[PDB]
Amino acid sequence: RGKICTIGIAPWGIVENQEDLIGRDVVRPYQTMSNPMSKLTVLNSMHSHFILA
Amino acid sequence: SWIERAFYKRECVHIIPSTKDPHRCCCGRLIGQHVWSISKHTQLSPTDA
Amino acid sequence: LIENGVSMHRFLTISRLEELYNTRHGPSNTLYHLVRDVKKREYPK
Q1: What distance, in Å, lies between the first and last C-alpha atoms of chain C?
Q2: What's the CA gap between B10 and A53, in Å, rounded?
Q3: Rounded distance, CA B12 to CA A18, Å?
Q4: Which run of H or of E encompasses B45?
Q5: H helices then E strands: how many in chain A?
Q6: Helix, strand or coil for residue A29?
Q7: Chain B: closest CA distance from residue A2 (Å)
Q8: Which residues contact B24 (CB under 8 A, 6 or more apart)?
Q9: What is the Cα C44 distance to its own chain's centre?
Q10: What are phi and psi of B9, to 5 degrees?
Q11: CA distances from B26 to B5, C27, C41 (A)
Q12: Which among B10, B43, B42 has a CA at the least distance from the CA of B26?
């Protein structure tokens, strides 16, 4: 039943599809697909907060 | 608003040590695909992501 | 396919939802009866 606070702390220089990750305080569209071509890796979908830096 | 006028980020301009790739600067992207201070010379700027 | 993440945003185009309506296969639909009643009342083949 829970809604669990599961904050992950990532880098910004590693989050995949950084061009898809541009914008400021908008509810921003994320295709949750991970393309295996770029060595940059996505954020986990099942966590609830992210501290990419 | 209190989020927007607070947080800070960093960005790339420097003397371009080539090392491995001439296209790669110290940041590490392609030659036309670019857009601490020691050997990378990254600065401070406001966040955008 | 949505569990993989074929987003219903990006799949759906104007031409796509044309093709989804315009398809005449699969199971039965009463579309044929009703849309002919639509164009008969609206535009009196």
Answers
A1: 38
A2: 10
A3: 16
A4: strand B45-46
A5: 0, 2
A6: coil
A7: 28
A8: B18, B30, B31
A9: 23
A10: -135, -175
A11: 29, 60, 69
A12: B42
Contact A14/A41 with Cβ under 8 angstroms? yes
Report phi then psi at A40, rounded to 5: -60, 135
Q: Best interface-test mutation with B: which of A17, A19, A20, A25 has the largest number of B CBs within 10 A?
A: A25
Partners of B46 in beta bridges: B8
Residue type (1 letter), C8: M
Q: Give A26's contacts in chain B (Cβ within 8 Å).
A: none
Side chain identity at residue A18, one-letter code:
Q
Among residues 4-33 of chain B, which lie with CB inside 8 Å of chain A?
4
Contact C7, A31 (CB under 8 A): yes
Resolution stated for this PDB structure, in Å = 4.0
